[PDB]
Amino acid sequence: EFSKKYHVLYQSNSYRGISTNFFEIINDQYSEIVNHTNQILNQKFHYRDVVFALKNILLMGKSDFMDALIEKANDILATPSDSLPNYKLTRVLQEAVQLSSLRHLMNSPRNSSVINGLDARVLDLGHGSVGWDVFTLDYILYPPLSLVLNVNRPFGRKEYLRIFNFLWRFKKNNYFYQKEMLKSNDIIRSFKKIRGYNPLIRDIINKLSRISILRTQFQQFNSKMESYYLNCIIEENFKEMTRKLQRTENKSQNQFDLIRLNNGTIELNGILTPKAEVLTKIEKTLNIDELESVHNTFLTNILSHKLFATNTSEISVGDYSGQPYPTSLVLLLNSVYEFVKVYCNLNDIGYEIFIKMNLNDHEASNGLLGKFNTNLKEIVSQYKNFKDRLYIFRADLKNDGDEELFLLSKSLR
Amino acid sequence: YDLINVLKHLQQIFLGYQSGHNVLKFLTKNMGELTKHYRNDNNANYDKLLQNFELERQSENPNNLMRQLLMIQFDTETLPQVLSHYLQIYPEVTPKSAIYHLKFDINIPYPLNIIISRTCMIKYQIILRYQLVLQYHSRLLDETWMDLNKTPSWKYRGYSHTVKRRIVRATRVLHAKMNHFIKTIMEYFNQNVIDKEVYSLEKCYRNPTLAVAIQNELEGGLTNIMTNRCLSDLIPLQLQIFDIVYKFCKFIKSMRAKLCQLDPVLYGYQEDAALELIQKLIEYISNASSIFRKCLINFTQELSTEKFAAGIERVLYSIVPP
Amino acid sequence: MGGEIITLQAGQCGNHVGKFLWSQLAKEHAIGTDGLSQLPDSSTERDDDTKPFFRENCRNKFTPRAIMMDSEPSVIADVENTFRGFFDPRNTWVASDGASAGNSWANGYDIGTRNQDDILNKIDKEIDSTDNFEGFQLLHSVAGGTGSGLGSNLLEALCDRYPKKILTTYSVFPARSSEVVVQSYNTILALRRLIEDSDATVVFDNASLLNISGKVFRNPNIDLQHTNQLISTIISSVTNSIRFPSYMYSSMSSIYSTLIPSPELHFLSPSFTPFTSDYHKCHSSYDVMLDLLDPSNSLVSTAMNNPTYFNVYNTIIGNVEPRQISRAMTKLQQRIKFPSWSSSAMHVNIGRRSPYLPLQPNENEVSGMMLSNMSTVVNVFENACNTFDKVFAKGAFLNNYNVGDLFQSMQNVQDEFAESREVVQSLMEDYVAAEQDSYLDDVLVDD
Amino acid sequence: GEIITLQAGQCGNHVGKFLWSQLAKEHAIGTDGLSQLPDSSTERDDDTKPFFRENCRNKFTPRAIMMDSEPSVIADVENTFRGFFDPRNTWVASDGASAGNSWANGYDIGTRNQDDILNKIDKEIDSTDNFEGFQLLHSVAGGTGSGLGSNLLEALCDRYPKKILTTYSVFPARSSEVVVQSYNTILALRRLIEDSDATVVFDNASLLNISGKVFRNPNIDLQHTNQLISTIISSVTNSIRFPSYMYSSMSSIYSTLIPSPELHFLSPSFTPFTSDAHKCHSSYDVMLDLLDPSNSLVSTAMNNPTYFNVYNTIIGNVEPRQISRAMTKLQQRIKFPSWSSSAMHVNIGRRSPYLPLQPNENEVSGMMLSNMSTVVNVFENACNTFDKVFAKGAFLNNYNVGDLFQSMQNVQDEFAESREVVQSLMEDYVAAEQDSYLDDVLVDD
Ligand SMILES: Nc1nc2c(ncn2[C@@H]2O[C@H](COP(=O)(O)OP(=O)(O)OP(=O)(O)O)[C@@H](O)[C@H]2O)c(=O)[nH]1
Ligand SMILES: Nc1nc2c(ncn2[C@@H]2O[C@H](COP(=O)(O)OP(=O)(O)OP(=O)(O)O)[C@@H](O)[C@H]2O)c(=O)[nH]1
């Protein structure tokens, strides 16, 4: 219908050459086709909703799904092998979307196609690799969306993938911390013993409470960096992108497109248009290349942020460390995971001490306290290294210059 | 294009027209950096200045295209040496305070750069640098009055009934004379040159007929400003007085903490070192008063013998002695 | 880490708070008074998760995951008349043994211990009707007879019966010294369990409740049915990051790993800014964050003589940008007094206003909540002790605390009272001792 | 920066009522705080922020904190402007009915609730970032005004030691209560001389005189007199609210006006004004009439009123050459002391763009704050009454409250110290008039 209409329109002008009203018809046709292609993308192929179910899977703007997923996948991920079933993960995903707020999408009459695109892929790290670090989620887009929405294209930078891994770090820390918190609350609350016990038990209780406080310091720092990311980088750039995608919804009149250069010099882009000057007497939407530019701008803005930029010479390094900020932060997260490992070992051996002294009251296998004290020295040394690294990272941020980095550092202290 | 509004915003940025509070805000947020190092020191980290400016611009009105385009810059040439490229003045006779190197500029967007040429933009920029120097020394004397009337060390009644005069009373009298001179120079300039040219330009675009006529009025206003005596002939003596007032504000910020060691309020302790300090302050204060009086008589004599408004007579009335 | 939460309502005040809490949760999810979704079938897109606090029967009807229990059936019956068919009458339980023989802890704990089978069968029936279970929500009113006794036996059973799940009682505390003897007795007796068995517990003060209700309600006819309103508001804002999932805090386990550093410091203090969830004046989000530290906004006895905040957690609801939140926290980090042994800080959480709530005019863009783990929470407990000890040394009312007890002796019951008092003393000891920077040096230097 | 108004007393809150009605007229705010301007534009010509707070509703809240001992006057104000003021700033504490119009009553109402009032002040400052100083509106005759303003000055001279404490003090005309009125006057003047940074002084005699000789109502209703104080404060702060090239802070104004922290009592003058025979009073005529003793708001009428500092604020269509001719005339006319400079500072201010030129109002209007040698003549009545009554017929049975209550000796000592500091102020003014002020300063060098 559109082709017939505009072919008639142009053939009715074929005699005037390439005139100005030929350009009028060009403008009308451009507006119409771009409006309709946006409307088709949204209403017929769930463009907006796939953008959202992208921010809510690979950017983790919905934590219920990720917690349910990671629960159901504890049995598979925790196997530190590549010889995983890799097909039980299908059911893991089915039951995750089942046991989240995304069951309102997998059971939606029209939007089920949105959630049927979510699939997982495993990385390649070699033999002995851990199912926790090979595992990644993904989104499988076919045309038309695969043309407009940039996702882990087989030759792109896979920015969604690296973002998912960087936040999978935080999510693994959260899972292990909450599991260990429940185990430790069980351990401590199990000391409903008559104070006539040997003082070793009271010493255990005090030591375990102080270990709990140090673990809490760890987990607070972890959750703090996680919140900072998913609220000031992901959420911020996503709100920017969503503002862009609905720009015709009467936004603030920041019409002045300024060009800013690395030398500080700025200038308006092109020509200053007049304030709707009239002498004689319809949305402005975005086309395909413009939508893909918006999505790539969102993803770049997220990966250009200082706490994501890695592997180039354009990086500014944080003084008092001499390193790029993301290297420091990933070192902090690795130390966090090593701490949760030693702390789970400590909780296990504490359960052992308790159940052995409940079997034989200080009468058998008291030598567990040697391993207990060695693990105590280990966890306190690691906490000390942790606080050192935290002070290093705070000094890094405080001397960068950006206001938000200064404020993050101060909030971290 | 609402060129009236564009000129209004350009006069708010570079002339100070109806925008004194913005300049005061800029100074208070940036009072420390514009006096630091007396220069850009080894490409000093004056990027913090740019960051402050961009932070303020983020809170600026979005419909004000000119302040969105305002670029704070640090030019490697002092305001007098920049003026020496057009007028018969003389350069410094050493690094000199950072506000003397501070400047602004706008890449006026097409077509607005047809009327608002680069020549009138350079005139705007030099005028703004001069206005910033004046308002900066006025803010210096404001905060000096503040420290002289909010620090109990200075309000304290005492000082041997002799030290009080030769130190505090001479200080307050010289500070009052400095304040009257600076505020009177700024009054004369702002409301007898800047205001006159703003009013002339405003008269021009009341039903004009030629774009070249509007350009001519704009450039003639900025030339009347840049060729005005207090911007083109009194520049060296104004610089002298500016150095004197800056040294005196340094003296006051120092005495703020170094005066609590003189009267019993210091509770060596009122030993002969205290009297040595007292005599040194008497000598330095007499030095400041003498150099100020000499340069001020110089200023008055350069005023009377030259030729034109009666704002000059107001300046005389302010600075001439009994 | 994540799952569903059973809501156990025990005692008259607990059940009143429960009625208001379920009315609220219905308002924030369009569930109606009967469990019938008021949402038209034209909008099948839900961004929330009622599943944690409602069971969705295949009949498109939500039964609230609750077990209403009591001894005086009239209040639960009235609730069921107000929520017609909403709760499952197969969850209710009254034991039909008559009115309680007094308002003491002994009656509650005895009606609990005589029907432990019925109670644990109800709770097992509610758990097998789900898959992923995380914890409980007990509404308590610690200083009542029913409240104290039922909550005490409940905590005793569920400390080891479901020994992986995060139990949390929501204990309301009275204000008056009229019947202070029996009420403080019950308070200490049940605090034994709110310290011994529970994994978490929030506290409110009827004094500050009455004060803030008199302030915000333009009615000197302040009924406790208007303070259960604020209690439910606090519970709603606490569980908002569960009933409307978002970036950070999915479930209770996470918010507690943030809030409760060690199992001893587990009493929490609410604070809430002007709000419309009940029957305007305007501010910003910066104003909300600043008013969150107002003594006249906190719901527990403040006594803010330089209080020590060990863990603060904000919840901001509505149209809010992290810029004003960052600036407000920049102001409040140099204002709130945090003990120097901690290098952590305040946990802010930006939450989504319920899409089903009435579209608010932007005069009241934002609303907020603050949970705080501060040492000055024990001031509600000191008033209980400073009566219990003096009336217990004289043996007042020690006869009503032997009902069905295995210790029918006066002496051993006095011993149990003194043991619970020693537990509360240990609580206050740990609260005041955490203020000492050498608290962690038990491990940090003692190598 | 930011300036929080502080109204203490019945006179203080009347000044606040008329002042805020005026300031709301000038910025088109109305009586509810909602801008009477169409939101079609996002560009404003003024800076309301130094005196008004902006909430998320785009309503303007006057940064004021109203104080009183009888909630009747504050309730009258808050009912006149329904929804304008934020009631979380109003404070009376209802600490019973005042036991007389005694300075000790207000001073004790302050000493017993310093916690509450400083918490309110801290809260209102928390709604700002660049805070500059306070405006303390209060009379000096009454008990509430005098005592509460004295305690406010004592608390804010140190609780906020880097801010400008401005007082706009209305002094009384000789009334039947002359004894207690003069006692409160000297008691409060102790603090006005010791703590305030700048004190504008209004004499009720000249205020009533001018109000009668302008208003058509022959009976001088003191509420009508209040409009002159309101106009003076508006004119002072007009260089800040509607900014211009020169004076964007009260710091600059006072540094121009105040030589030392011993001569800081400013004598306002204004001409002309018409309220709810034009002659058009051209700007030269206005600048000349500014020095006519018939326009001063403090009765001086002296043949040698030595002006130390002068600062005129001309508002409207001002012709600078007229200003310069008038300055020539005045530099010939005005008697400046032979030890200081002869500069009269003219700040050519702006008229409110949202305030239309009212019929029978002048094209130009000017205000003068001057630091004369004879503002102490406002204090002579009080000092004479105090020295001729406190000697034998003391009324000190009313001033025994709080710590002063602990002994009549305490009240006697405080009255003596206050009279001593007032005498010190008068010695300062009479001394700085002589040429010998700088002899032993610069000549003996
Ligand atoms: N929020 C709220 N609290 C209440 C209400 N009624 C009583 N309370 C509080 O609950 C305490 C009493 O506990 P209850 O739950 O009534 O238990 P009880 O004392 O044994 O009373 P019964 O249920 O009649 O046996 C009182 O001290 C009150 O502080 C109410 O209606 N609403
Ligand atoms: N301009 C003006 N002056 C007033 C006003 N009210 C009182 N005064 C003057 O202030 C003097 C007394 O001070 P008040 O303001 O009445 O204070 P007060 O006497 O302590 O009375 P309370 O504040 O009620 O305790 C009177 O002699 C009046 O001259 C007023 O509303 N406007």
Numbering used by the authors:
A (entry chain H): 424 to 704, 715 to 846
B (entry chain G): 413 to 505, 552 to 725, 751 to 791, 801 to 814
C (entry chain D): 1 to 279, 286 to 453
D (entry chain C): 3 to 278, 285 to 453
In the authors' words:
In budding yeast, homologues of the grip-containing proteins (GCPs) GCP2 and GCP3 (Spc97p and Spc98p) and two copies of γ–tubulin (Tub4p) form a 300 kDa complex (γTuSC). Spc110p, a distant pericentrin homologue, recruits this complex to the nuclear face of the spindle pole body (SPB), while Spc72p recruits it to the cytoplasmic face.
Realizing that this would require much higher resolution of Spc110p-γTuSC interactions, we focused on obtaining higher resolution structures of the ‘open’ (γTuRCWT) and disulfide trapped ‘closed’ (γTuRCSS) filaments containing Spc110p by collecting new datasets on a direct electron detector and incorporating symmetry expansion and 3D classification into the data processing pipeline. To improve the resolution, we performed symmetry expansion followed by focused classification of segments containing three adjacent γTuSCs. While the density connecting the Spc110pCM1 helix with Spc110pNCC was at a lower resolution, we were able to model residues Spc110p112-206 spanning the Spc110pCM1 and Spc110pNCC. During the transition from the assembled open γTuRCWT to the engineered γTuRCSS closed conformation, the γ-tubulins on Spc97p and Spc98p slide past each other in roughly opposite directions, undergoing translations of ~6.9 Å and ~7.7 Å, respectively.
